[PDB]
Each structure stands twice: as structure tokens, then as C-alpha cells.
């Protein structure tokens, strides 16, 4: 009603989804009224580098099973291909090769074809294309026009969706204006927003894109994807910061999910609710209903708590806000003779985190198997805060100098080990707090050695 295409694009780098996960995702999609899937995993060689090579029968049979499942689930299956690393745009033989590659899909009932040119060189690679075209946009437009014209003479109502080589940031770029002029209007055009993974997508922004393209764009929305340098981040937070009236300027939205499919269901649930009724969408309401349905009511408050340490994404790029504020508050308490209050706050927070871990660790489902590395490092950060508690308590009492010194040793050791953490759970917020415990307790080492009388800042003797 609001969006014609309400989709998932499997378009990420990293380990492609398993055949069974795709089939399962199609059931999740139907449950939440998502009606469109694009096959485009970057690490499938036959999608991209070896785009000329046809799929073997074993693979084509799996595609047939996917296509039939999609149809039974009310999902339009789109097969995408990415030829732009080596395509000779002007070559008649190359067109024939692409048509040969997609023919098995045409014969299995797929009428929607993706042809993507993201992440390729910004200028023409081949001399024969430089002789035929003034620039990339012209070559691509002519190629896509010719592919469409061929498909109209092959099947009934073919549809092409293309991804431009410039797919984010400046909507008034010359390339985009050439593409809007020269692409036939019914070829759909992808766009990811102001950034690759966009913080916000506004109506104003998509209005501009619409003008240059001379058509409503289709959004390739890069959330919850956590590929490449984002792999350490667990993107489980709600879909957010997409204007309630984007539907006016956008024909549809495909979400690029994580290589963790079960974990993706949490934000994808919220994404689907936004698409269903964007004017009544509340991300916190949606996220809580998502957690209840998918993971169970009894894990809700534990998930709420655990999510506070997994906020980092394009949607919430800052260091985790709750813990950032809390440790600043605790440090002010210590700096203002409110020792009991600061220690209490730290104590209560540790208990909350232990309870949260213990609760979620008890659950056996696939979701909790996928997010286990984040749970493990979450517990570790909690163990370290517990030792910070001991260190501060013994600092304020003073004999307990031994327990304080011992805590400094422990913290020094684990802060070094924490350099090797694989995830971005708790950001660097717990790290920086623990490092400051180390800095805040320098003078007890000086006191231990009777060096206070001659040690100068930063806490050394010199001449």
C-alpha cells in the first residue's frame, strides 16, 4: 500500500546465506508482509567475477527450489548479476553472454533481473568502449537499454533494476543526470542514501535523487549489514531515521541484511513494520514486539539491557550512550565526595549485566548461537568492571592496599588482552573507564614504595 517493493536484498560481502536459511527467511518474509527478494551475494563468484560462466545443474536446481518457495510465499524473486568489473559495454558478444547466463532464470519464471554496477572503476576500462561512449553513464545506459529491448522480445513484462556506479552521496552528479535522461523510465534505479550505510534518509534527499533520475528511486538500504570493517558490530537495533513520507518519493526499499540471518530477523522485523505503516512506526515499540515474538517475552528486559552495549551502527554511530553517561556520572560522584553513590551505581550496573548475560546464555535457539561472540565478550567486560569495583572500594577504605594493587595488576593484564577482542560490544566505553581506573590509582604504587615525597607528575622520579 505504501511501498510496492518491500524487500530483502542478499547483497552483502562475506559468507552467503545457506540454502535452508533462504527458504526459512522466505517464511519470515511472508509472516511480515515482505514481498521481494534479490539474489546478489558478492562472494558467489558466478554473480560477479565469473559472471560469464553459467551455473551448473546442481546450483540451478537449488535456484528452482528458491524460486518456487518465493512464489509460494508471495515473494517476487529477482536474480541479479554484476558484470561491471570486466564487461565490454559496446560488445554485442557480451550482451549475448549475459542473456545466456540469465536464460535458465527466465525459463524458471523469473521476470525481474538485477544488473548492478556498484564498486567498479569510475571510468571505462576498455578502449572499444572509450571509442563508442563519452562516459560510464552513456555506456551503461546503452547496455541496459539493449538488454531490456532483448528481454521484451523474449518474455512477457520483463523488469530490470540497476545499481549505478555512483549510488550514494551527491544526488546531482552529472553521471546520475545522464543516467536519468538515457535509461528507459521503467528500468528501476538503486540508491543507498547520503552514505553507503546512511544515518538518515529524508524526503528532501530522495526528492533530489528523483529529479536527477527522472523517476522514483528504489532504496538499497544498507542496514542491518555488518560486512567488511563493520563485522565487529552486532547490528540488532531497530530500523530508524527513515522519514515517514519517503514512500511519496521511493518506489520501494530493499534491506541489505547481515551474513547472520537469524540475528537479522530482529531489525528486519522492525523494518517490515515501518514499511507497513510508516506514519505510526515507533522503533522502540517495534523492537520490543520483535523481541517478544522472535525470542520470547521473558527475554525482553535482558535484551533491552544487552542492546544498550550493541547500539553502534550507521543509525547510532556514537559510543554507547547509556554507559558513556553512567561512567561520567560515577566519576563525578568519586570527584565530589559521593563515594557511596558511585560505588552503588557501579555495583547495581554489574549485577544488571550479570543477570542479563545469565538470562540470555540460558537460551538455546539459533539467534543466541549467532550472537554468542558478543555475549562472551559482554561477560568479559562485566568481569573486568567487577575488578574495577574491588579496586575503587579498597582505594576509598584506605590493610587493603594489597587488594587495590592486585586489582591494578589484573586490570593492566585484561586491558592488554582486550586489544584482541573480536567484537565492538560496549564500544570502547568500558575500556576507557577501566584505563582511567589504572590512571586514577597510580599514587598507591608510589605510596607502596614510599616514593610520594619525591615523585613528580605524571608519577615518576627524575633528574
Amino acid at each position: 500500500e505504501y511501498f510496492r517493493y518491500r524487500g530483502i536484498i542478499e547483497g552483502f560481502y562475506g559468507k552467503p546465506w545457506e540454502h535452508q536459511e533462504r527458504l526459512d527467511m522466505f517464511e519470515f518474509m511472508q509472516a511480515n508482509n515482505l514481498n521481494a527478494y534479490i539474489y546478489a551475494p558478492k562472494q558467489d563468484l558466478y554473480h560477479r567475477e565469473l559472471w560469464r560462466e553459467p551455473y551448473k545443474e546442481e546450483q540451478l536446481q537449488l535456484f528452482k527450489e528458491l524460486i518456487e518457495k518465493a512464489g509460494s510465499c508471495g515473494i517476487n524473486f529477482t536474480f541479479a548479476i554484476s558484470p561491471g568489473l570486466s564487461l565490454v559495454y559496446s560488445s554485442e558478444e557480451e550482451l549475448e553472454t549475459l542473456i545466456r547466463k540469465i536464460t535458465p532464470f527466465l525459463e524458471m519464471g523469473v521476470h525481474s533481473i538485477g544488473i548492478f554496477f556498484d564498486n567498479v572503476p569510475f571510468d571505462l576500462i576498455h578502449e572499444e568502449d572509450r571509442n563508442s561512449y563519452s562516459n560510464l553513464a552513456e555506456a551503461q545506459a546503452d547496455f541496459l537499454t539493449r538488454v531490456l529491448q532483448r528481454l521484451e522480445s523474449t518474455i512477457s513484462t520483463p523488469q530490470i533494476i540497476m545499481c549505478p556506479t555512483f549510488y550514494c552521496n551527491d544526488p546531482n552528479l552529472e553521471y546520475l543526470r545522464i543516467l536519468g535522461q538515457r535509461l528507459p523510465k521503467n528500468i528501476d534505479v538503486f540508491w543507498t542514501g547520503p552514505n553507503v550505510c546512511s544515518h538518515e534518509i529524508t524526503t528532501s534527499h530522495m526528492q533530489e535523487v528523483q529529479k536527477s533520475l527522472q523517476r522514483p528511486a528504489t532504496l538499497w538500504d544498507n542496514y542491518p549489514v555488518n560486512d567488511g570493517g563493520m563485522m565487529p558490530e552486532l547490528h540488532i537495533g531497530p530500523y530508524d531515521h527513515r522519514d515517514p513520507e519517503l514512500h511519496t518519493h521511493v518506489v520501494g526499499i530493499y534491506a541489505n541484511p547481515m551474513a547472520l540471518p537469524e540475528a537479522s530477523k530482529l531489525p528486519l522485523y522492525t523494518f517490515a513494520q515501518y514499511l507497513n505503516s510508516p506514519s505510526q512506526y515507533n522503533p522502540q515499540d517495534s523492537w520490543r514486539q520483535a523481541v517478544s515474538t522472535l525470542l520470547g517475552e521473558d527475554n525482553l528486559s535482558a535484551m533491552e539491557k544487552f542492546y544498550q552495549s550493541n547500539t553502534i551502527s550507521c543509525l547510532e554511530p556514537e559510543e554507547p550512550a547509556y554507559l558513556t553517561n553512567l561512567f561520567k556520572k560515577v566519576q563525578e560522584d568519586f570527584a565530589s565526595f559521593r563515594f557511596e553513590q558511585g560505588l552503588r551505581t557501579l555495583r547495581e550496573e554489574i549485577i544488571s549485566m550479570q543477570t542479563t548475560y545469565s538470562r540470555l546464555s540460558t537460551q538455546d535457539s539459533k539467534f543466541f548461537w549467532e550472537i554468542r561472540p558478543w555475549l562472551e565478550e559482554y561477560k568479559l567486560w562485566t568481569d573486568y568492571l567487577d575488578q574495577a569495583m574491588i579496586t575503587f572500594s579498597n582505594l576509598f577504605t584506605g590493610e587493603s592496599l594489597q587488594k587495590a594493587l592486585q586489582g591494578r595488576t589484573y586490570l593492566r593484564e585484561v586491558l592488554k588482552d582486550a586489544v584482541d577482542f573480536r567484537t565492538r560490544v560496549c564500544g570502547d566505553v568500558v575500556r576507557n573507564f577501566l584505563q582511567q581506573v589504572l590512571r586514577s590509582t597510580v599514587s598507591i604504587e608510589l605510596q607502596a614504595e614510599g616514593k610520594e615525597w619525591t615523585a613528580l607528575p605524571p608519577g615518576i622520579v627524575r633528574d
Partner: peptide, 5 residues
Amino acid sequence: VPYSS
């Protein structure tokens, strides 16, 4: 930093 960058 995304893989696409």
C-alpha cells in the same frame, strides 16, 4: 567502515 567503503 563498510567493505564497499
